[PDB]
Amino acid sequence: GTSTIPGFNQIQFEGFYRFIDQGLIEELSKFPKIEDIDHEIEFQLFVETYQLVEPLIKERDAVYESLTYSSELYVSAGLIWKTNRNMQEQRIFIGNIPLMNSLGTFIVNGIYRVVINQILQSPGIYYQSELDHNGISVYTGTIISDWGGRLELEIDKKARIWARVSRKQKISILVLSSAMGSNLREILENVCYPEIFLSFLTDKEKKKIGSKENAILEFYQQFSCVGGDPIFSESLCKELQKKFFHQRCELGRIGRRNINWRLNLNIPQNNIFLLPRDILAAADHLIGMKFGMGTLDDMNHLKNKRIRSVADLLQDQLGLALARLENVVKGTIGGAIRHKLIPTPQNLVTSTPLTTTYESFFGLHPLSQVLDRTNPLTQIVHGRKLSYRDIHPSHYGRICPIDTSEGINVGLIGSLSIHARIGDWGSLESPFYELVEKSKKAQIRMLFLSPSQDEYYMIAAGNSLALNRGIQEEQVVPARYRQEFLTIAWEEVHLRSIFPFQYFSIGASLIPFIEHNDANRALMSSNMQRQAVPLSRSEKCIVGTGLERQVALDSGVPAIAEHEGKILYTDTEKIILSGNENTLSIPLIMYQRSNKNTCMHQKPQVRRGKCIKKGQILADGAATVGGELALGKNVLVAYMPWEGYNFEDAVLISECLVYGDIYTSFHIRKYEIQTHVTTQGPERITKEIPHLEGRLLRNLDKNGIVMLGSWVETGDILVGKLTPSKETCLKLPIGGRGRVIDVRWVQKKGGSSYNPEIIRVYISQKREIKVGDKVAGRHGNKGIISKILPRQDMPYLQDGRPVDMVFNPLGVPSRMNVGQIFECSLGLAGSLLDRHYRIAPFDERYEQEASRKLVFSELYEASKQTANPWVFEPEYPGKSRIFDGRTGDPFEQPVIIGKPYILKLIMEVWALEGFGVAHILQEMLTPESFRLLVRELRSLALELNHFLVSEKNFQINRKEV
Amino acid sequence: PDAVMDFRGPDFHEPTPNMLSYLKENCKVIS
Amino acid sequence: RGQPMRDGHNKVYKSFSDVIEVIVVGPS
Amino acid sequence: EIEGTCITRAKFENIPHDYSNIVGIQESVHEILMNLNEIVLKSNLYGTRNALIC
């Protein structure tokens, strides 16, 4: 990450390595030794001989059989029976630990899962000051533990300091301090304001403070709010310690560091627990804070936050799982003792505490998410998400300012920047280039800065292409310093931001000419690129940013050589590579369904006799050409209104996109069924289904499952099933026509007399582009196809070629996304010149109007080289007169034409009352709504009777409600 | 337009090892 | 009353008081 | 308004579906159909004709 863009999955990869390399020991060493009531039998774990066994199955097997890709944790355990003094040691099998793929994904019950990163408040001390109802400043200081425990302090109106443990519980400072062993004498001496502390000492409080034991009882009375006088006992402290001090006063290493630096204390970094002086120091600054000495904390600063990655969560689950196993053995140890049997260390340990703790974490934890496999981009960006609304200056280079969610979570789910990295205290770090003085070695000038260090460096993003009669060091550039912007000389600059993609996420970094787009359209563009369907034929963009190749490499979608050598054999199914007397066979994915019913398919990118290095590409996956992400197509486009068929975001297209198969995609839908044992018997699969026409059963085989390669339609039975008999067959739903490409059938090998039978049918649909489909560029220009015209009806160019799509030009000025205009012109030049362009964003740093110069010069070269003068018109560059296909007359004004990259994507009652349509409203409401209301009111001993009084004879009728 | 990206070029990070083979190589998983 | 009754899965019981309280353009 | 002539369908002998593979052919069944689709023919007459690859 110092001189290249890091691997996009690096954060997941390092985190899992830390969990295996160090995380296991920290939790396996917290497992208590288990001793019985009589202390006769003692069980212990020899942690130094812990082992991990490679999975017996392969990753593709764990998906085919819906199993879990996992490793076996083995430890040696000793069991001493003092009745016989025999120490028996065996290799105990604690359970399974799910393993992570190189792409940062887990396979749990066959489902690809990704653990996303959480951002949380870091432990430490934070000095706030909130205004009361009268506008009087009140200063508050809160201590946060490693568990999130909050020990709040405050200054009240009478200056009495209270330890607010909850909204209703208040504890005086002196009582809490004395319960921890601090006598009244030292507290006064070591605080800057002893006269303040003595001023609140009531006579009743002094007698209790005088002894440590009585202060503990006083603290318990206030903390528990229980009427009465408790009696000191060892059990009371144990209950008090877990409820309060185990949850709230265990700072940890990060909290101790933050407590020390914030409060200016020289306390060793090894002390992870709260000290009486730390509480006392918080009291001192709180007073000095009220009187103008210092600054208040900013809770939204990233230096006050910390990131919890897959290492933190997987280590918590192991710690939670080891607490269960201890009580599992405690229950089993008592049972063996009650039966006077010698228990084998094995029978004392069952695997479920470790296996079921992880299946339940992956299935239920909100940070464990099913991997989005719509396209290669969705796979790579899912693992870089950050879950918690405003942009903060500390975010720059760490959290993308654009990529956020749309709706109600906006600003609470963000993305990590491309060059970001997680540091040694859960902090996000970003790399900057250091400008060092003359006399220093300075081997590597690229350094990673945490958010705390960022404020105190002068960071410039300008360049040094400016000279006057003076000297270069005196030229001024915009820089960031202390969370603001200045203009300083170059000689005062400490650091330079030099990486082109430093400040943005992956999605924003795929938008060419992004600096010409309003920042709101760049957010909508990131979302649309995540909805792009892989096409049956793939094609590289003419114009890109250059990040497309990195996405292809990190997604895992292509096949990359794990070994150097030469290619000997390629076909549709495999590629054989041999190097250094070692031959490897690499299978190729074919027509495999993804999470969102998209089609994955690999095609070889190498031939026989071609030499390969390790890490080079072998095959192209879906939406990938030549090692580049390829989410769309380059098509001929004109920007003009066309008879209202492109009104607003509507898009008019040519029939050639349909019969050319330009935007045709494959969609594989999986239909499933299971057998269950009802009270009347087991469900059966058979072709012989009574009372059904033979036409529907024509696709079934002898066992009652649809044949391979059949052409099924809506209503056609896929699996014949009988429920003891009533028909419960797997019928194809509406809109599911297609071809059966794979049938799967297996019985789950369980311990019961009946093993459930599971059938899966995979049906492939080839979907061409249609009216109602949605398309989009990369600049937040999204459209819906409203009309498909024959090619002779389309507007056509001065070379006679009709255009493929017609976009509304009125969509650009309102949306302020000028970048699509640059891209379309440059795309046309590239196609005529047989060129592709990969342009890093913010090219204006070189010179004014850099994009205009690049686009116009390339347009002119395309016009000159191909003798196509309409391509570059000196009178109006980028635009040309085009012709109406219906009439042959030219359109009056010149029109921008180009070849952009286009992707294909995956009160009412009041209004009726305002119209006075009483009978329509009655129909749309219909009574069961009111009859059910009466019964619910009856449950509360209320009766609601509806009476009609006749206007004729005044007789009252009780309606039947 | 028909270029094949060379993933061992100077602008690319070092090849990502297989996670299992990496764990076995560093002697944290036993066959 | 204060802290409401909760079940074993840390869920507060609901009483009766809680119970009662695509388009395409056509220009022609 | 100008007419042309080309292959309208293909029948395979021992193929389950058009997305399978054949032992001995580098290309897949689906790739064969695309190669058949790009074959340019000429004829002045109308009617469904049949041709053969053996």
Place this chain on the structure above:
Amino acid sequence: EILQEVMQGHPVLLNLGIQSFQPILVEGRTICLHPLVMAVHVPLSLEAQAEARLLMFSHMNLLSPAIGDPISVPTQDM
């Protein structure tokens, strides 16, 4: 053929967020709306059909109730 017959003269409600239109059968799979405008309701009773045709149609509601301004003024490309 029957569907075309019974649809004629039978308005439907589309949800000025909710209005009444006379439906016509179109080719394709999408609902087609005129440029100056998903739940579809079919009035059943003759009382409801009268209200839809005579009160909720898009030509007796040309003025907005707020100040009396026209509702369907041409915009954008028009």
Place this chain on the structure above:
Amino acid sequence: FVREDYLVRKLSAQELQDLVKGERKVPLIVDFYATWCGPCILMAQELEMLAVEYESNAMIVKVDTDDEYEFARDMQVRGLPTLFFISPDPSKDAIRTEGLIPLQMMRDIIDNDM
């Protein structure tokens, strides 16, 4: 378990001494480079590909001029990048090339002159 990412070995002058004095059967190709020289980045990728092509039929090594400056000068290195093609036949004289030569030109020297 994990294949190494780089085939070309970096040798000291002393190590290269024993390799040339000792008995050799395959052609020996020696690359002089420096990490600060821009063209050496391009040459490093060509020699890695040449190592894959010639698995055991050639031996490709490299020497850093920052570490073995005196040795490079005595070998008549006039600049970078410089390649030496040393035959297994002790009577034949070595071939010194200068500049970013094409991969095919390296193959012709190895096949026809080594």
